[PDB]
Amino acid sequence: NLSLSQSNFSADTYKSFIKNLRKQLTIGASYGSAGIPILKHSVPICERFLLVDLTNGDNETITLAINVEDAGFAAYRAADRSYFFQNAPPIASYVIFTDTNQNIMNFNNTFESIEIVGGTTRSETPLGIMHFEASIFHLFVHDENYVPTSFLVLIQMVLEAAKFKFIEQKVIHSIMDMEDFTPGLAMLSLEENWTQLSLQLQASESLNGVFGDSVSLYNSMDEPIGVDSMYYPILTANMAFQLYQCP
Amino acid sequence: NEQCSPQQRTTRISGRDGLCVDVYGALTADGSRVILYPCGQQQNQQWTFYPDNTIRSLGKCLATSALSSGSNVVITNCDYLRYDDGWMVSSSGTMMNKSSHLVLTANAATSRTNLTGENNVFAAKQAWRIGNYVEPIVTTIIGLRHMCLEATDNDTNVWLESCVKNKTKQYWALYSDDTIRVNNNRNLCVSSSTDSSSKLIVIRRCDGSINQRWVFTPQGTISNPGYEAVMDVAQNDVYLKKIVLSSATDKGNGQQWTVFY
Ligand SMILES: *[C@@H]1O[C@H](CO)[C@@H](O[C@@H]2O[C@H](CO)[C@@H](O)[C@H](O)[C@H]2NC(C)=O)[C@H](O)[C@H]1NC(C)=O
Numbered sequence A: 001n002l003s004l005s006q007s008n009f010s011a012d013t014y015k016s017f018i019k020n021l022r023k024q025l026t027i028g029a030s031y032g033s034a035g036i037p038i039l040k041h042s043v044p045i046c047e048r049f050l051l052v053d054l055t056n057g058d059n060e061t062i063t064l065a066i067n068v069e070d071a072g073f074a075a076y077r078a079a080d081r082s083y084f085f086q087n088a089p090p091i092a093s094y095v096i097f098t099d100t101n102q103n104i105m106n107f108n109n110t111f112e113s114i115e116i117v118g119g120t121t122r123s124e125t126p127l128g129i130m131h132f133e134a135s136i137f138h139l140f141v142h143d144e145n146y147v148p149t150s151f152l153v154l155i156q157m158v159l160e161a162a163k164f165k166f167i168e169q170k171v172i173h174s175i176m177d178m179e180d181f182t183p184g185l186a187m188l189s190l191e192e193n194w195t196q197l198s199l200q201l202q203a204s205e206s207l208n209g210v211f212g213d214s215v216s217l218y219n220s221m222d223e224p225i226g227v228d229s230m231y232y233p234i235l236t237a238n239m240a241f242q243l244y245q246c247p
Numbered sequence B: 001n002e003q004c005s006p007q008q009r010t011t012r013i014s015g016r017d018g019l020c021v022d023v024y025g026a027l028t029a030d031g032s033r034v035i036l037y038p039c040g041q042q043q044n045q046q047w048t049f050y051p052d053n054t055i056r057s058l059g060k061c062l063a064t065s066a067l068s069s070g071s072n073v074v075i076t077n078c079d080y081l082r083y084d085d086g087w088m089v090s091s092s093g094t095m096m097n098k099s100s101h102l103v104l105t106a107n108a109a110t111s112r113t114n115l116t117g118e119n120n121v122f123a124a125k126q127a128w129r130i131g132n133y134v135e136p137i138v139t140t141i142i143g144l145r146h147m148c149l150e151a152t153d154n155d156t157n158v159w160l161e162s163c164v165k166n167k168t169k170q171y172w173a174l175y176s177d178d179t180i181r182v183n184n185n186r187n188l189c190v191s192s193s194t195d196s197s198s199k200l201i202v203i204r205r206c207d208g209s210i211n212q213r214w215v216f217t218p219q220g221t222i223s224n225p226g227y228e229a230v231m232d233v234a235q236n237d238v239y240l241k242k243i244v245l246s247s248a249t250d251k252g253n254g255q256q257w258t259v260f261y
């Protein structure tokens, strides 16, 4: 499996991991005018999951199952145990981690659901190398008090970074500065709007690249920038792939 | 999902020097010319896009006024274009008449300049941002070895240096005409070489040229489409302090860039 380990976690190795993850997710992608790959859709359940290994500073490893249709976590394995989100595709447990003691987490893989059960938001959850490391531990032992925030960390540092070069770069800055951060409005507005940007980009094919609705993306000075077309470098040089939305 | 087929959207259009596409005097007569003008909220800068490939302001359609290059772009009665295929906008913001291939062009930078239909050479004066948000986007530009492009030698050269938050000369203003401008001197633009003998990318006074038109591609390159080449770190070595224009290749990582805003 594609893997990222605490023991070899530099800017260079992180960047390669995210680059490879994007490549794997975009196998068989479709392309529009914008040239931003659109993830596969209607994927048979048996081929719907990409497995990724993360190893922490105790040399313990978890394997996460990423749904290739939406680049979200469906489940993960720790040793001989696995854990499925309650909105994982219904048949997923027959396809992945079959040879393990399977458990259902009583919450969805969405930020809104994770934040409600954990009682903690992304804005208050630090990101960085040591939080990546600790999140893997908490998931490995499945400490229910820390499972939600551990997903907030790993979803953002792995999946959201794959979706957006801006977010990847935030993590890279963190590694190089040896400095934790919490996502601000820039990062959250990307995460919030990934599905809406996917819809507008694809829909814009019929309107000379103009969107049906404007999307507000914040910059690092907390100024909202209206993105109402494909002609914004903060979108088209940032968003690495899209959710399938339009025929 | 009827959201896949938007029926229309009203937006602004900005280009050279961040000025907007404007129906001069808000005049509505057929043949009324369009100009550059400082961006505002007035109705004659509101362009409504429809799926018939029309672009409309004041209820009339943006259109070329001749088959040959050099004549004004105007607004005219939409019924006149009933059998016309309309405008096509490229992913890099070239606005082209589909039949004649003439593109929307600003031959000067000054307010009230008449916009014309001209042969496409991919100049910055032929690049446009369709969108309501018309301001330059302020950013760092990150490249090889996770370093930042920096304006050097009194804003005449450019190369990679270690990224330092708020170091003034590492900020760039991305304009609606596809220019990359020194953030604290917005009369100066990143430029491909004007000397045949050199491939070196430099900083020069903004002039609307092919040399100053840059497209941030989804594949992570900074492309000069008129010269069919991309920004590259000389010899993939940041310590040479040389950024050059090269044919796109996968050989090294020197052609990969990130916009960090
Ligand atoms: C794009 O250019 C073409 C060609 O110059 C324009 O077509 C002409 O339209 C005028 C006015 O309707 C007619 O009198 C001519 O007969 C047309 N010429 C040809 C050869 O078709 C067209 O109007 C332009 N369209 C836009 C939207 O700019």
Ligand SMILES: CC(=O)N[C@@H]1[C@@H](O[C@@H]2O[C@H](CO)[C@H](O)[C@H](O)[C@H]2O)[C@@H](O)[C@@H](CO)O[C@H]1O
Pocket (backbone or CB within 6 Å): B022, B023, B024, B025, B026, B027, B037, B042, B044, B045
């Ligand atoms: C037709 C005219 O001159 N009317 C004035 C208005 O129109 C403006 O014209 C300028 C060009 O000089 C530009 O196209 C701009 O977008 C238009 O708003 C305007 O001056 C108005 C007051 O704002 O007064 C009219 O008299």
Ligand SMILES: *[C@@H]1O[C@H](CO)[C@@H](O)[C@H](O[C@@H]2O[C@@H](C)[C@@H](O)[C@@H](O)[C@@H]2O)[C@H]1NC(C)=O
Pocket (backbone or CB within 6 Å): B033, B072, B114
């Ligand atoms: C821009 O377009 C209009 C419409 O065709 C032209 O008439 C303008 O010509 C200018 O004004 C006329 C009255 C005359 O003085 C002419 O010589 C001027 O050039 C034209 N404007 C420019 C700046 O070319």
